[PDB]
């Protein structure tokens, strides 16, 4: 298990920085009114990127910083969420989600690092774990919430957005317990590498099929 998370790890490092410089290299496909959002998505993959070169080194040093892994978060799952809001939300509404949204998404990997760097199986282990659940579960059904009412292409591409936010980030609390369900601290490295990919690579993607909705294609 310890090969396999070192070679993810490498694996995922280019494959961060692979997001970042495509999704840059597509933004010329879609209206400039609407290059935000994929250089917003560029962005994340490359903040991801740089603290992936920091884990993977991390991991192969044998003394590992899950620290580097949570910072990321930390910085990217806020950003993520401006342009998830964009399509729905403009002025006061707008800025409102963006704030309480990012709140809460501080809340929840705090209290997932306070666990996290616990006793496996404590108290405060499972304190952190039940908090950030909660808070998981409150952002989860707020972007439930969002865009009840769209249309057409554009409620599609939507939902399709919604749908790998709401299915691809179980992977983060699951690989949280893989260490209370077996001998399994390198299949939580795993879980997370595979979902940080699968989830910012993905959400940049979806980000840039919303642009090029939005642009009138096809
Ligand atoms: C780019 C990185 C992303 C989108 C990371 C998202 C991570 C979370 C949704 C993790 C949440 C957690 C729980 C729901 C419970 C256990 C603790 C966390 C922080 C792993
Ligand atoms: C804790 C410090 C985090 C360090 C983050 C470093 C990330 C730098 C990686 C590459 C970013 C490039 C993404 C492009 C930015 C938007 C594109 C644009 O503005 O035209
Ligand atoms: C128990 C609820 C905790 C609420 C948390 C409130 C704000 C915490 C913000 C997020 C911290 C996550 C990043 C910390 C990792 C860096 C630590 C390190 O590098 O050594
Ligand atoms: C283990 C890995 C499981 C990954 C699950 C990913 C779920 C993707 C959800 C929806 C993606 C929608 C793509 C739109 C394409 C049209
Ligand atoms: C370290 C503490 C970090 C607290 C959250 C920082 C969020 C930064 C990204 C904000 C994006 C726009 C809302
Ligand atoms: C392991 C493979 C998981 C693939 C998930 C893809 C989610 C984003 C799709 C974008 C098109």
């Known amino acids: 298990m310890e090969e396999l998370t070192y070679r993810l790890f490498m694996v995922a490092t280019v494959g961060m920085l692979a997001g970042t410089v495509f999704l840059l290299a ?7 009114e609407h290059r935000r959002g ?14 992936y070169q920091k884990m993977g080194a991390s991991w192969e040093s044998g003394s590992y910083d899950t620290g580097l892994r949570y910072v990321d ?12 809001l964009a399509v729905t939300r403009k002025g006061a509404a707008y800025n409102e989600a963006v704030r309480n949204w990012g709140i809460a998404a501080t809340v929840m990997i705090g209290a997932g690092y306070y666990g996290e760097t616990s006793a496996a199986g ?4 499972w304190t952190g774990f039940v908090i950030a659940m909660a808070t998981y579960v409150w952002l989860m059904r707020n972007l439930q ?16 957005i919604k749908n790998l936010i709401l299915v691809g ?8 317990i893989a260490p209370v369900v077996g001998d399994f601290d390198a ?16 959400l940049g993607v979806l980000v840039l099929q919303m642009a090029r909705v939005q642009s009138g294609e096809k």
């Open 26 to 32: 597509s933004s010329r496909e879609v209206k400039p």
């Open 38 to 51: 994929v250089y917003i998505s560029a962005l994340v993959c490359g903040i991801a990127w740089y603290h």
């Open 73 to 84: 978060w930390v910085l990217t799952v806020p950003l993520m969420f401006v342009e998830v």
């Open 122 to 125: 404590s108290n405060e282990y």
């Open 145 to 160: 919430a969002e865009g009840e009412g769209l249309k057409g292409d554009q409620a599609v591409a939507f939902e399709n």
């Open 169 to 176: 980030w179980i992977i983060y609390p699951l690989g949280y």
């Open 187 to 202: 299949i939580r490295e795993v879980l997370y590498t595979i979902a940080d990919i699968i989830n910012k690579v993905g």
